[PDB]
Write an enzyme that holds these catalytic residues in place. Structure first.
Site, PDB file in Angstrom:
ATOM      1  N   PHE A  18       0.767  -1.205   0.000  1.00  0.00           N
ATOM      2  CA  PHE A  18       0.000   0.000   0.000  1.00  0.00           C
ATOM      3  C   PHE A  18       0.808   1.269   0.000  1.00  0.00           C
ATOM      4  CE2 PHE A  18      -3.726  -2.397   0.287  1.00  0.00           C
ATOM      5  CZ  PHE A  18      -3.707  -3.287   1.377  1.00  0.00           C
ATOM      6  N   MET A  82       7.977  -1.361  15.479  1.00  0.00           N
ATOM      7  CA  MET A  82       8.826  -2.565  15.677  1.00  0.00           C
ATOM      8  C   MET A  82      10.196  -2.211  15.212  1.00  0.00           C
ATOM      9  SD  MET A  82       6.630  -4.812  16.895  1.00  0.00           S
ATOM     10  CE  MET A  82       7.286  -6.421  16.490  1.00  0.00           C
ATOM     11  N   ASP A 126      -1.467 -14.253   4.229  1.00  0.00           N
ATOM     12  CA  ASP A 126      -0.122 -14.026   3.686  1.00  0.00           C
ATOM     13  C   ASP A 126       0.910 -14.114   4.778  1.00  0.00           C
ATOM     14  OD1 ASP A 126       2.053 -13.398   2.007  1.00  0.00           O
ATOM     15  OD2 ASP A 126       1.147 -11.547   1.241  1.00  0.00           O
ATOM     16  N   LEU A 147      -5.077  -8.067   5.732  1.00  0.00           N
ATOM     17  CA  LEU A 147      -5.100  -6.935   4.837  1.00  0.00           C
ATOM     18  C   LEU A 147      -5.063  -7.338   3.326  1.00  0.00           C
ATOM     19  CD1 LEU A 147      -2.870  -4.240   6.564  1.00  0.00           C
ATOM     20  CD2 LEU A 147      -5.319  -4.450   6.470  1.00  0.00           C
TER      21      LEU A 147
HETATM   22  C1  LIG Z   1       4.860  -1.444  11.890  1.00  0.00           C
HETATM   23  N1  LIG Z   1       6.045  -1.352  11.012  1.00  0.00           N
HETATM   24  N2  LIG Z   1       5.839  -1.515   9.678  1.00  0.00           N
HETATM   25  C2  LIG Z   1       6.871  -1.592   8.863  1.00  0.00           C
HETATM   26  C3  LIG Z   1       6.646  -1.762   7.450  1.00  0.00           C
HETATM   27  C4  LIG Z   1       7.339  -0.949   6.566  1.00  0.00           C
HETATM   28  C5  LIG Z   1       7.203  -1.066   5.202  1.00  0.00           C
HETATM   29  C6  LIG Z   1       6.271  -2.018   4.754  1.00  0.00           C
HETATM   30  C7  LIG Z   1       5.588  -2.774   5.619  1.00  0.00           C
HETATM   31  N3  LIG Z   1       4.655  -3.711   5.025  1.00  0.00           N
HETATM   32  N4  LIG Z   1       5.122  -5.060   5.007  1.00  0.00           N
HETATM   33  C8  LIG Z   1       4.310  -6.000   4.582  1.00  0.00           C
HETATM   34  C9  LIG Z   1       2.984  -5.681   4.109  1.00  0.00           C
HETATM   35  C10 LIG Z   1       2.144  -6.701   3.582  1.00  0.00           C
HETATM   36  C11 LIG Z   1       0.863  -6.388   3.133  1.00  0.00           C
HETATM   37  C12 LIG Z   1       0.023  -7.497   2.501  1.00  0.00           C
HETATM   38  C13 LIG Z   1      -1.339  -6.960   2.065  1.00  0.00           C
HETATM   39  C14 LIG Z   1       0.763  -7.961   1.208  1.00  0.00           C
HETATM   40  C15 LIG Z   1      -0.088  -8.685   3.431  1.00  0.00           C
HETATM   41  C16 LIG Z   1       0.374  -5.108   3.270  1.00  0.00           C
HETATM   42  C17 LIG Z   1       1.168  -4.129   3.756  1.00  0.00           C
HETATM   43  F1  LIG Z   1       0.640  -2.862   3.919  1.00  0.00           F
HETATM   44  C18 LIG Z   1       2.511  -4.356   4.156  1.00  0.00           C
HETATM   45  C19 LIG Z   1       3.400  -3.269   4.674  1.00  0.00           C
HETATM   46  O1  LIG Z   1       3.083  -2.078   4.745  1.00  0.00           O
HETATM   47  C20 LIG Z   1       5.717  -2.733   6.987  1.00  0.00           C
HETATM   48  C21 LIG Z   1       5.025  -3.733   7.788  1.00  0.00           C
HETATM   49  O2  LIG Z   1       3.626  -3.435   7.866  1.00  0.00           O
HETATM   50  C22 LIG Z   1       8.212  -1.440   9.367  1.00  0.00           C
HETATM   51  C23 LIG Z   1       8.399  -1.226  10.666  1.00  0.00           C
HETATM   52  N5  LIG Z   1       9.637  -1.051  11.329  1.00  0.00           N
HETATM   53  C24 LIG Z   1      10.887  -0.894  10.773  1.00  0.00           C
HETATM   54  C25 LIG Z   1      11.958  -0.638  11.699  1.00  0.00           C
HETATM   55  C26 LIG Z   1      13.228  -0.520  11.149  1.00  0.00           C
HETATM   56  C27 LIG Z   1      13.416  -0.626   9.788  1.00  0.00           C
HETATM   57  C28 LIG Z   1      14.776  -0.450   9.236  1.00  0.00           C
HETATM   58  O3  LIG Z   1      14.938   0.386   8.387  1.00  0.00           O
HETATM   59  N6  LIG Z   1      15.800  -1.143   9.733  1.00  0.00           N
HETATM   60  C29 LIG Z   1      17.168  -0.878   9.174  1.00  0.00           C
HETATM   61  C30 LIG Z   1      17.935  -2.205   9.144  1.00  0.00           C
HETATM   62  O4  LIG Z   1      17.919  -2.797  10.462  1.00  0.00           O
HETATM   63  C31 LIG Z   1      16.620  -3.372  10.696  1.00  0.00           C
HETATM   64  C32 LIG Z   1      15.664  -2.180  10.800  1.00  0.00           C
HETATM   65  C33 LIG Z   1      12.280  -0.837   8.984  1.00  0.00           C
HETATM   66  N7  LIG Z   1      11.077  -0.956   9.501  1.00  0.00           N
HETATM   67  C34 LIG Z   1       7.308  -1.187  11.582  1.00  0.00           C
HETATM   68  O5  LIG Z   1       7.423  -1.019  12.779  1.00  0.00           O
END
Ligand SMILES: Cn1nc(-c2cccc(-n3ncc4cc(C(C)(C)C)cc(F)c4c3=O)c2CO)cc(Nc2ccc(C(=O)N3CCOCC3)cn2)c1=O
Length: 263
Positions: A18, A82, A126, A147
């Site tokens: 998204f 997270m 998923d 989702l």
């Molecule tokens: C809550 N939250 N969310 C995302 C996040 C971000 C982008 C995408 C998605 N994502 N993933 C899957 C998805 C799947 C679907 C379906 C419909 C396909 C199932 C629909 C969707 F909307 C999504 C979706 O948005 C998420 C997770 O929600 C990332 C989070 N935290 C971090 C923390 C650090 C770093 C980082 O940069 N580092 C650096 C290196 O060291 C490690 C840490 C990156 N992220 C977080 O807390």
């Protein structure tokens, strides 16, 4: 409903189905992640109605939904932050040098979340290491449960689409679109394989199309080196050709606890 006046937008956390997700603060005090839902990507009205039910899913191993912003566009989805990001990338960093008890605890974290969803008759659809997140304490939580129902992209929603989770799907989903509890069970077995393989791609030398054939013919992922026979039996039990012969998440959890005690 969160008031967007109470949010700040501090750092990009990547892009998902998204669009962009940002880190920020809510009320000048609480860490959050904020999905900013890209135009055209979501069945927005359906999601808004479902968010009401999703506000009531709460478990320590499920990423916590804090609220939504729906009196505007783009819509926002506000969750628990997270700090360590997605499990798939976390598994792939060799510096963590995981012990096998830590791998089994990640499986247990996810299994607890999934047993709670199963108790609510709520499918993920998923489940995979890319769709689990890791907090600052190393706890794994399940993300983005349910989702998939709101995704507009045909490449994701079609079972022969380029984005469909083929390698995590049981034969009856790929052949017949037969989704059930037992299809999340199959995916959970694949996720345990991902964990014990330190984030390798399942069926690493096959395409999606070849995977769908391999599995319809009865063949299965091999035991990762780090998995004991007992751990392999658990993941393997998720892949029975008869959906009804696969365990429940309650049974898996008991199996995992037994193996933890054994090992
Ligand atoms: C809550 N939250 N969310 C995302 C996040 C971000 C982008 C995408 C998605 N994502 N993933 C899957 C998805 C799947 C679907 C379906 C419909 C396909 C199932 C629909 C969707 F909307 C999504 C979706 O948005 C998420 C997770 O929600 C990332 C989070 N935290 C971090 C923390 C650090 C770093 C980082 O940069 N580092 C650096 C290196 O060291 C490690 C840490 C990156 N992220 C977080 O807390």
């Amino acid at each position: 409903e969160i008031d967007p006046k109470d949010l700040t937008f501090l750092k990009e956390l990547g892009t998902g189905q998204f669009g962009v997700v940002k880190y920020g603060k809510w009320r000048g005090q609480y860490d959050v992640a904020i999905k900013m839902i890209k135009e055209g990507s979501m069945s927005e009205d359906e999601f808004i109605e479902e968010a009401k039910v999703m506000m009531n899913l709460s478990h320590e191993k499920l990423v916590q939904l804090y609220g939504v912003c729906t009196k505007q566009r783009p819509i926002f989805i506000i969750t628990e932050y997270m700090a360590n990001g997605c499990l798939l990338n976390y598994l792939r960093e060799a510096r963590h040098a995981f012990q096998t008890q830590q791998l089994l605890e990640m499986c247990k974290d996810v299994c607890e979340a999934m047993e709670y969803l199963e108790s609510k008759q709520f499918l993920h659809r998923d489940l995979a290491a890319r769709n689990c997140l890791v907090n600052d304490q190393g706890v794994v939580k399940v993300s983005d449960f349910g989702l998939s129902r709101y995704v507009l992209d045909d490449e994701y929603t079609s079972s022969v689409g380029s984005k469909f989770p083929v390698r995590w799907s049981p034969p009856e989903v790929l052949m017949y679109s037969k989704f059930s509890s037992k299809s999340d069970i199959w995916a959970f077995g694949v996720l345990m394989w991902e964990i014990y393989s330190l984030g390798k791609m399942p069926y690493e030398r096959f395409t999606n199309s070849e995977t769908a054939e391999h599995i319809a013919q009865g063949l299965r992922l091999y035991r990762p080196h780090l998995a004991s026979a007992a751990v392999y039996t658990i993941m393997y039990s998720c892949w029975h050709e008869k959906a009804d012969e696969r365990p429940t998440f309650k049974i898996l959890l008991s199996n995992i606890l037994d193996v933890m005690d054994e090992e």
